[PDB]
Amino acid sequence: TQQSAANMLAAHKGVNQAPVPLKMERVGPHDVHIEMTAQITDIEIDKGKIYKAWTFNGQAPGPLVVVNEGDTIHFTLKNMDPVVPHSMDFHAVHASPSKDFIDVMPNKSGTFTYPANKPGVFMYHCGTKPVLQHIANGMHGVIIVKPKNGYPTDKEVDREYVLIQNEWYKYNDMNDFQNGVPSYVVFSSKALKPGDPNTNGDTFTLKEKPLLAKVGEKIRLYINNVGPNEVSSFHVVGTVFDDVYLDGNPNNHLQGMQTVMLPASGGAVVEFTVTRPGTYPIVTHQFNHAQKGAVAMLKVTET
Amino acid sequence: TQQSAANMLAAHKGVNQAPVPLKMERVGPHDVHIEMTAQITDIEIDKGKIYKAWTFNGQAPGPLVVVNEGDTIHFTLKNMDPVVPHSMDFHAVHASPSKDFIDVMPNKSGTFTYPANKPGVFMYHCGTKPVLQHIANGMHGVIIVKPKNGYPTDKEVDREYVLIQNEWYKYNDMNDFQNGVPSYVVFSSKALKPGDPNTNGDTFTLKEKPLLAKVGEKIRLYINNVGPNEVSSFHVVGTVFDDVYLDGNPNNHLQGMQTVMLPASGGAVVEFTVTRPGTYPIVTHQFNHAQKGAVAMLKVTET
Amino acid sequence: TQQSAANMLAAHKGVNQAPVPLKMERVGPHDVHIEMTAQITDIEIDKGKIYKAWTFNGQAPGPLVVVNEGDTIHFTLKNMDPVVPHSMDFHAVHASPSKDFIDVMPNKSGTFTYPANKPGVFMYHCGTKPVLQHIANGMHGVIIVKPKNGYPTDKEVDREYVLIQNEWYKYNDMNDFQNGVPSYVVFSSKALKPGDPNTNGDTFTLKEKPLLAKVGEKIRLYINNVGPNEVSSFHVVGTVFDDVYLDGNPNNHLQGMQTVMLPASGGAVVEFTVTRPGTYPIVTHQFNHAQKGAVAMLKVTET
Ligand SMILES: [Cu+2]
Ligand SMILES: [Cu+2]
Ligand SMILES: [Cu+2]
Ligand SMILES: [Cu+2]
Ligand SMILES: [Cu+2]
Ligand SMILES: [Cu+2]
Ligand code: NA
Ligand code: NA
Ligand code: NA
Ligand code: NA
Ligand code: NA
Ligand code: NA
Ligand SMILES: [Zn+2]
Ligand SMILES: [Zn+2]
Ligand SMILES: [Zn+2]
Ligand SMILES: [Zn+2]
Ligand SMILES: [Zn+2]
Ligand SMILES: [Zn+2]
Ligand SMILES: [Zn+2]
Ligand SMILES: [Zn+2]
Ligand SMILES: [Zn+2]
């Protein structure tokens, strides 16, 4: 295991591949092209701590993907990793894992086609053995599938953001990945509209640069806890969730939740009102994880 | 961290502030005054183990607070801690955390006003940085907000109690709080009506003095797992939950659950029937935690 | 603790009791006889790793029990353990734990009667102090109670299997049981119909011999995470759950879930469609546990 890690260290030594933009375009009323990369990219996960992350597109978690319910995805993965194969598993899709979530070799590309027939906030991740290693090293993200008939509370929502929770462990350390507590637990935000922040899973960015909102607004968060290993007790300080849709399916409706339990890979659409000006921490209420980085901020102003 | 803990030890050495009763009174059809303390109080959490707890009112978890849906709370915190600032975060309320959940200095008081517009079983806790430290040291509790229109099963309920789950760690040890397994996991009960028990989070009291009920009764428990860190798999041995309302919101109705998953800070209203005389253990079904203290007893008699 | 374990080692040394079939028969429209054993049986939980398991009937998890909603169970436990008392707790039943879930001494039998009035997928386990020790050593299983009025989606289901998740720790090590990470986390399958596999909780069997299905089929899994200690993030790779019934109660209906959060002892009925030929991994998405064994396979063929 650690001999392989020593070999990995030599092969990825000095490798820092600049982020490559996600490419997407609609090619039919129910067909969409998506082109992503697997690449090796240095990310500062805490001040003074660089993690040479295994990523989609040089982000960890990876870039946001948004499609409509009923879209068939024509997906291409370009593997830029000089030595490790990589793959893609979208939780949104119906696919044959052994035919459609297969490995793409270093310096090669693979193309796969599958439908997204279910609305919600789905995890995506690399599906290459050991899957734990590929996820823990940074190969995770979110795909949102917009419901054909929306959510019953759509008209009430004033502003929206995407938040993702993930853990970071000791660098490419399989023993730690399997047996150790996370070194950091973090939130990131991925842009839905021009001007939205787009950040990586780190301990600081969403504290230094809070998400922004106005007094009185109803805020929707599309959220997913990608793990790899921990569950999340999602809570926004100073408010209560008016409405919650588990995994973002409109049918899984809950009301007036203080805290939303998310399994590893679990998602939700949560909506809440901010009644007063100020800064509202966003946490996992498992406070050991909050202490290890998992606190984002929402700054609410009159204007 | 441990130099600060050594300084903390010196400052709280010999400090054992006797419990001070919660003070509450209604001042209008939708307005209620609540007066609490932050204080340092020795609690026996296991036989032979004294924890010099950071508390509200000399109890850990703190005293029960009950209000009605739609009540505005006029809250005062009197900080009796000679050296550490403290604050209050009620999960029931809509408030500006940076204006309304702010620190109160040693030997000072602070007053804050906010509405409780949502029914349920909410965690409250100290919101002072590091929040993990303040919660782990004992600054947690429950506020119940009674629904305007009750619960659909109100008429079926024969008896009710409040139960709270919490963990205890190595004394004021931030490394342990962040990285270690809990030393003890415990239940406590807080009084709803005269004659109800009112206990602290310890490994023994609810075993030695079980909650009481009669054969055939439908029992309601208002429950919250305050953590700080663990989730709870709440189960009453020998019965099944007839009805469950997640976070105590009447809309989040489940039926016939064997076990209720609670996130850290998660609450519920659970209802079950005890059909035969005997003693019924109440557990988290995460049995490592049950073994470390988290078993309460319900003694059911013909009379 | 470890002196008792040393004494236990001597007493169970060389003991390997061959599996004994479950015995069940219906004795009335709403009355069923069930006869089980407690016995000590060597199980290979990972290649080269024998665990001298404490079991019901020489299986760990124990044999599947299926009854109808409203059945009263006349249950007999025959304790074959030469030295340790054992008992039975069925989560399906209403019973007095202190009268009905009581210990049966070595080489004795006990008979208990109680109703199963609630539909669902319930854990059963030994209830002998320390309960953690008896569960961790292998005394867990599932009882299914079939709903009187079925599930609304019954007509859509093409094939069904039972899956159970459990952990294994260091052998009969109470310190590890309470404080340590699981050494292995595993799935097993228990037969519902002739020809179904029936396996023990190990890291390999459901990989080497996948569950079988046909292209296009809707599959139902009756699932329970028996722990003892961990929660489960249940996910089938390459599909989405069309319908989920929490604890197998028809009322607790969710739709379009990617992943189902199960507490320790938590169950569910989950249904999903497999659209393409291939092999579909079944995991807990807490990937440290998946890496430590918790991956089963579903092989889907045209025929
Ligand atoms: Cu990969
Ligand atoms: Cu909180
Ligand atoms: Cu405090
Ligand atoms: Cu149990
Ligand atoms: Cu036993
Ligand atoms: Cu996955
Ligand atoms: Na953990
Ligand atoms: Na900066
Ligand atoms: Na733990
Ligand atoms: Na006493
Ligand atoms: Na664990
Ligand atoms: Na074999
Ligand atoms: Zn196309
Ligand atoms: Zn195409
Ligand atoms: Zn608005
Ligand atoms: Zn007033
Ligand atoms: Zn006032
Ligand atoms: Zn009654
Ligand atoms: Zn009979
Ligand atoms: Zn009989
Ligand atoms: Zn079909």
**Do the annotations mark residue C158 as ligand-binding?**
yes
Tokens 């609810």 locate to: B206
Q: Exposed, middle or buried by CB within 10 Å (0-12, 13-18, 19+), for A111?
A: exposed
The three-state secondary structure class of A38 is strand
Tell me the H-state helices in chain A.
2-12, 97-100, 131-136, 174-179, 205-208, 287-291
Residue A283 main-chain phi, psi, to 5 deg: -135, 160
The answer to whether the CB of A135 falls within 8 A of the CB of A125 is yes
User: What is the stated resolution of the deposited model, in angstroms?
Assistant: 1.3
Please tell me the distance between residue C227's alpha carbon and the centre of ligand 7 in angstroms: 16
3-state SS of chain C is CHHHHHHHHHHHCCCCCCCCCCEEEEEECCEEEEEEEEEEEEEEEECCEEEEEEEECCECCCCCEEEECCEEEEEEEEECCCCCCECCEECCCCCCHHHHCCCECCCCEEEEEEEECCCEEEEEECCCCCHHHHHHCCCEEEEEEECCCCCCCHHHCCEEEEEEEEEECCCCCHHHHHHCCCCEEEEEEECCCCCCCCCCCECCHHHHCCEEEECCCEEEEEEEEEECCCCEEEEECCCCEEEEEECCCCCCEEEEECCEEECCCCEEEEEEECCCCEEEEEEECCHHHHHCCCEEEEEEECC
Tokens 């960890």 locate to: A60
Indicate the DSSP class of residue A202: B
Query: Do the chains contact at C228 and B287, CB–CB below 8 Å?
Result: yes
Report the C-alpha gap between B151 and B253 in whole angstroms.
10
Q: After which residues is chain A broken (C to N over 2.5 A)?
A: none
To the nearest whole Å, the CA of C127 is away from the closest chain A CA by 28
| CB of A108 less than 8 A from some CB of C | no
The answer to whether the CB of B236 falls within 8 A of the CB of B298 is yes
Report the 10 Å Cβ neighbour count for C279. 17
Q: Which ligand is nearest to the CA of C209?
A: 12
Instruction: Please list every residue in chain B whose beta carbon sits closer than 8 Å to the beta carbon of residue A234.
Output: 263
Query: Do the chains contact at C278 and A122, CB–CB below 8 Å?
Result: no
For C90, name the nearest residue in chain B, comparing CA atoms only: B238
Instruction: Please list every residue in chain A whose beta carbon sits closer than 8 Å to the beta carbon of residue C276.
Output: 94-96, 99-100
Tokens 């109690």 locate to: B161
Report the 10 Å Cβ neighbour count for C208. 8
Beta bridge partners of C146: C68
Rg from Cα positions in chain A: 19
**Do the annotations mark residue C140 as ligand-binding?**
no
Beta bridge partners of B55: B39
DSSP class per residue in B40-107: EEEEEEETTEEEEEEEETTBSS---EEEETTEEEEEEEEE--SS--B--EETTS---HHHHS--B-TT
Domain with A98, as residue range(s), is: 1-303
Name the neighbours of A, counting chains with at least 3 Cβ pairs within 8 A. Answer: B, C
**Is the link from the previous residue into A228 a cis peptide, with omega within 30 of 0?**
yes
Name the neighbours of B, counting chains with at least 3 Cβ pairs within 8 A. Answer: A, C
The answer to whether the CB of A83 falls within 8 A of the CB of A10 is no
- CATH number for the domain spanning A278: value is 2.60.40.420
Nearest to B266 among A233, A237, A276 (CB): A233
Q: Which amino acid is at A97?
A: P
For A238, name the nearest residue in chain B, comparing CA atoms only: B95
Report the C-alpha gap between B182 and C223 in whole angstroms.
29
Query: Do the chains contact at B279 and C98, CB–CB below 8 Å?
Result: yes
Interface test with B, best of A241, A258, A271, A283 (most B CBs within 10 A): A258
Residues 6+ apart with CB under 8 A from A217: A158, A159, A273, A274, A300
Report the 10 Å Cβ neighbour count for C18. 7
To the nearest whole Å, the CA of B299 is away from the closest chain A CA by 32
The domain tally of chain A equals 1
Give how far Cα A275 sits from Cα of A161, A209, A217, Å: 18, 21, 7
Experimental method: X-ray
Query: Do the chains contact at C285 and A262, CB–CB below 8 Å?
Result: no
Q: Which amino acid is at B91?
A: H
Nearest to B135 among A281, A287, A300 (CB): A287
Please tell me the distance between residue C169's alpha carbon and the centre of ligand 9 in angstroms: 15
Instruction: Please list every residue in chain B whose beta carbon sits closer than 8 Å to the beta carbon of residue C135.
Output: 287
Nearest to A238 among B96, B132, B135 (CB): B96
Give how far Cα B268 sits from Cα of A115, A261, B37, B120, B244, Å: 38, 13, 26, 8, 7
